Amino acid sequence: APILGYWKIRGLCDPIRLLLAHTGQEYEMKEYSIGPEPGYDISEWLDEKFNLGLDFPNLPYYIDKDEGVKITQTVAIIRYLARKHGLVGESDEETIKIEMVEQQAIELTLTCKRAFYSKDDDQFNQLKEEILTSFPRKLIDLAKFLGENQYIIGDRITYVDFMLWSILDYLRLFEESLFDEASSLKDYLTRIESLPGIEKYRSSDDFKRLPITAPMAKFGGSI
Amino acid sequence: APILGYWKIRGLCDPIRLLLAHTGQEYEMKEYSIGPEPGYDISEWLDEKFNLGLDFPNLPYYIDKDEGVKITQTVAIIRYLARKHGLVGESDEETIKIEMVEQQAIELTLTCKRAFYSKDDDQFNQLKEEILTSFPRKLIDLAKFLGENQYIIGDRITYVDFMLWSILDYLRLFEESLFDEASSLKDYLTRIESLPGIEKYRSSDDFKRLPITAPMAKFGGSI
Ligand SMILES: N[C@@H](CCC(=O)N[C@@H](CS)C(=O)NCC(=O)O)C(=O)O
Ligand SMILES: N[C@@H](CCC(=O)N[C@@H](CS)C(=O)NCC(=O)O)C(=O)O
C-alpha cells in the first residue's frame, strides 16, 4: 500500500488527500504529531526524517515501495497522482489552462502560508492587508476563467480543481466576505464538496479533527 | 513569430529567455518600461494589458497567433516551451525528479522576490537573515541531489535546469559566500553558461543592460 506522511493538519497536504478521496485510492495515512507549546515537539518526524531515503526530506512525503517511488514537494506528489489517475489535460490546450490556474492556486496558497504563520501581529496584519486588497481581483479573474463551466477545463475534473478548492476553502474560513456574495466560486466549492468521495472524506472524523494549520499559527491552529 | 512580453529586467522571465536562447527559437521580445521614482509609471503596459485577450493578464506573457496560444504565469509558459522543444522528462521517474527540483526552484525564487522588493532596510535585513540562515541547507540538498550529474536528470538538460540556473545566478550575485558548501553548483552554473546559445544570449547587449529587478527593489535594481 502507498504511504502518505504529514502532520495532523490540513495544511499543504489537503489537495492531495482530496484527490485521493475523490479517486478512492487506498493508502496508509502516516501522521506525525506536534507537541504542545512552547516546545512544539516533532520528535516522531525527526526519528524517520533521515531514514526514509528522501531526496528533499520534508512533509508531505509519498512513498510506494511496489511502484518504486519516493516523493516530497506537494505539487510533485499531486501531479504524480494526477497522471496515475488520469486527472490531467487530454490536449496541450487543456494542459496550458490547468497549469496557468495551478500557478494561481500556488500563489494564493503560499501567500496564505506566510500570513497564517506570521511571527507577530505586525507581520500578520501586513499580509492580511495584502490578502484583503489583492485577492478580490484574483478571485474575479478566476471566476471569469471558470465561466459557466463545472470545473477549470470544463466538464472534466482535474487535479487543479483540488488545489483551487483547498485554498478557496481556507480563504472562506479566513475571511468569508471575500466570497460571501461571490456567487460562482461558492457554487464551485459546493459542486466539488458534493462529489461522493470528497463528501465522504469531509464528513469523516479523521478530517473533522484536523486544524488548517500547525498550533503556532496566527490563524487556523485549532478546530 | 511568437511574442514574449515583460519588463526590462531579468526578473521572473530570465529562465524562459535562457530556454529560448538554448533552443534558438525566433521570437519578438516586447518590453514595457517603468517610469521614474516615485510613481513608477507603467502606462505602456496598461495600454495593452486588457487588449491582448489574456485570461490572467500579467507579465510575462507569451502569445503565438499561429499556434493559437496565449499564456501567462512564468511556469506555465516555460512548461509549454519545454514540451514544444522536447525539454521534459522521458519517463515518470525523470518527471518526478524534474518536478521536485521545480518546486525547490520556485520556493527559492519567491522568497528572493519578497526579500529583493522589501519595503525598507528593516524588512530587507530581516529577510536577508532568513536567507543566510535557511538557504545554505537548501543549496546542500540541491548539490546532493545533483550528485556527479551534469544536469538534474543526468546527461540531458531539461527546462528545470534553466529555472535553477536563474535563481542560483541571482543568489550568487546577492551573496557569493552562499556557494561555500557547493563548489558543485558553481560548476553547474559554469556548465550551463558555456552552452553556445546561452553564451550568445549572456554576451549580448540586450542581456547586459538588464538589471535583475525593477528599480524600486532594495537589491538588483541596477545593472
Ligand atoms: N498550513 C499552511 C502550511 C502547512 C505547513 O506545513 N506548515 C508548517 C509550518 S510553516 C507546519 O505545519 N509545521 C509543523 C511543525 O514543524 O511544527 C498551508 O496551508 O499552506
Ligand atoms: N526579479 C524578481 C521579480 C521580478 C518582478 O517581476 N517584479 C515585479 C515587482 S514585485 C516587477 O518587476 N514589476 C514592475 C513594477 O513594480 O511595476 C524575482 O526575483 O522574482
From TrEMBL, chains A, B:
UniProt KW Transferase keyword: yes
Leading EC class: transferase
UniProt-annotated binding residues for glutathione: Y6, K113, Y117
One Pfam family hit: GST_C_3
InterPro entries for this protein: Glutathione-S-Trfase_C-like, Glutathione-S-Trfase_C_sf, Glutathione_S-Trfase, Glutathione_S-Trfase_N, GST_C, GST_mu, GST_superfamily, Thioredoxin-like_sf
Segment forming the signal sequence: none
A Gene Ontology biological process term: xenobiotic catabolic process
Span of domain GST C-terminal: 91-219
Keywords linked to the UniProt accession: Transferase
GO MF annotations in UniProt: glutathione transferase activity; identical protein binding
EC number: 2.5.1.18
Role summary: Conjugation of reduced glutathione to a wide number of exogenous and endogenous hydrophobic electrophiles.
Recorded family membership: Belongs to the GST superfamily. Mu family.
This protein's name: glutathione transferase
Organism, scientific name: Tetranychus urticae (Two-spotted spider mite)
Name of the encoding gene: 107360789
